[PDB]
Amino acid sequence: LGNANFENFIGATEGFSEIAYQFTSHILTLGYAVMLAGLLYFILTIKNVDKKFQMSNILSAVVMVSAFLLLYAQAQNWTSSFTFNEEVGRYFLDPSGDLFNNGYRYLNWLIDVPMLLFQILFVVSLTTSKFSSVRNQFWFSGAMMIITGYIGQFYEVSNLTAFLVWGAISSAFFFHILWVMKKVINEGKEGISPAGQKILSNIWILFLISWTLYPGAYLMPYLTGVDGFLYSEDGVMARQLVYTIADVSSKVIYGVLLGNLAITLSKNKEL
Numbered sequence: 031l032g033n034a035n036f037e038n039f040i041g042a043t044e045g046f047s048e049i050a051y052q053f054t055s056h057i058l059t060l061g062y063a064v065m066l067a068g069l070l071y072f073i074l075t076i077k078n079v080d081k082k083f084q085m086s087n088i089l090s091a092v093v094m095v096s097a098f099l100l101l102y103a104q105a106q107n108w109t110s111s112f113t114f115n116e117e118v119g120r121y122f123l124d125p126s127g128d129l130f131n132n133g134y135r136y137l138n139w140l141i142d143v144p145m146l147l148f149q150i151l152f153v154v155s156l157t158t159s160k161f162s163s164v165r166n167q168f169w170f171s172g173a174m175m176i177i178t179g180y181i182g183q184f185y186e187v188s189n190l191t192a193f194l195v196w197g198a199i200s201s202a203f204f205f206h207i208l209w210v211m212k213k214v215i216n217e218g219k220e221g222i223s224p225a226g227q228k229i230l231s232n233i234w235i236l237f238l239i240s241w242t243l244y245p246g247a248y249l250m251p252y253l254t255g256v257d258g259f260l261y262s263e264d265g266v267m268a269r270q271l272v273y274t275i276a277d278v279s280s281k282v283i284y285g286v287l288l289g290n291l292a293i294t295l296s297k298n299k300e301l
Contacts (some may be wrong), residue, residue, distance in 0.1 A: 032047050032122055032187065036251050037130040040124055040263055041112050045120035050263040054270050055109050061274040062101035068282040069094035075289060082152075083292035089149040092287035096141045097281055104134035134178045135273070139244075143172040146280065147207070153292050154218030154230065167210050176204035179248070190252070201245060211237060222295065229291045236287060240279035247272035 032042035040046065046054075072090040079087065101261030111130045112121035123129065147168035151161060182196030215234045219227045250272065260268060 031129065034129060034260040035132055035183070035186055036269075037266055038111075040266055041121070041123035041130065042263045044263065045115065045118060046112060046266070047120055050267050051112060051121040051267065053267055055105070057267075057271050057274050058101065058105040058108055061277055062098055062210060062293060064282060065094050065098040065101060066279050068285065069098060071282075072285060072289075079289065079292040080296050084294065085107060085152040086149040086285075086288050086292060087135055089152075090281075092290070093142050093285070096145075097138055097277065099290065100134045100138035100141075104138075107131055132183055136176060136183065139176045139179075140173070142281065144169050146284065147172055147211070149234075149288060150211075150214060150218070153288050153295070154214070154222070156214070156222050157217040159213060159217055164210060164214060170208065170212075171203045171206045175200050175207065178203065182248075192205050197245065199249060204241070204245065207226050208238065208241075223299070225235075226291055226294045230272050231288060232240050233284065233287050233291070236279060236284060240284070243272050243276035243279070247276065 032039040045247050069091060072087050072094060076084055076087040076091075106128060107128065111124060111127045113124045113127075114120070115122050129138050137293055148165060151165060156164065173215070177198050179200040182200060185192035185196070215237075221228075247269045250269040251260050251262075254260040254265075259265075
């Protein structure tokens with residue numbers, strides 16, 4: 031029962047305190063609440079950019095739909111998977127339940143990673159690179175990153191070393207994606223106004239940090255060693271917080287910045 035993942039492992043042995051159970055539940059709720067608010071934002075502001083850029087708004091909205099539904103479902107899965115034990119005063123894995131399941135989140139990554147990588151290609155323009163090649167490279171490596179991460183996710187409890195190995199293989203696809211995106215950002219800068227170049231610079235920093243938070247949260251319970259402080263409900267709380275911060279940053283703030291870049295590039299912003 032504690033086999034599938036670290037959350038279930040903790041739940042079936044030490045159990046979760048009131049604070050850990052509540053906080054995790056609240057952070058995951060805020061996460062899907064923000065997606066829903068984002069969905070409305072991207073729908074309402076679609077008229078603010080020229081037609082030629084609106085595929086980016088469209089993709090932002092679709093990402094919001096996906097993330098709202100899958101994060102909502104993940105939130106319910108968290109709350110219904112553990113019940114309070116009066117005696118000990120903690121929450122434990124409920125055998126009557128479905129158990130905590132990472133599938134919701136990994137499915138969300140599979141769907142959302144290619145749409146996030148794709149939408150920048152509709153705002154900013156390449157120079158020496160080709161659209162189809164960059165697109166194909168984003169899609170292949172993005173899919174492989176998530177798939178090999180999912181494979182790794184399986185051995186988290188039963189085989190920690192395989193968990194790390196597949197994670198490293200996954201990280202290699204990630205490094206490739208950073209490298210392509212860096213190229214896209216640099217080529218995108220050529221020929222647009224300095225105000226647009228500065229939004230692109232912020233997008234890069236945001237992209238770099240927010241995406242790197244995902245492997246960070248993946249590794250979170252083992253970042254303090256064999257039985258360090260994070261190897262506990264605190265590593266669980268920390269992991270779900272970082273995922274949620276990453277979710278809001280990589281999807282919502284990224285979309286907002288892209289939208290602001292698109293406005294800067296409207297036809298009237300020229301001579």
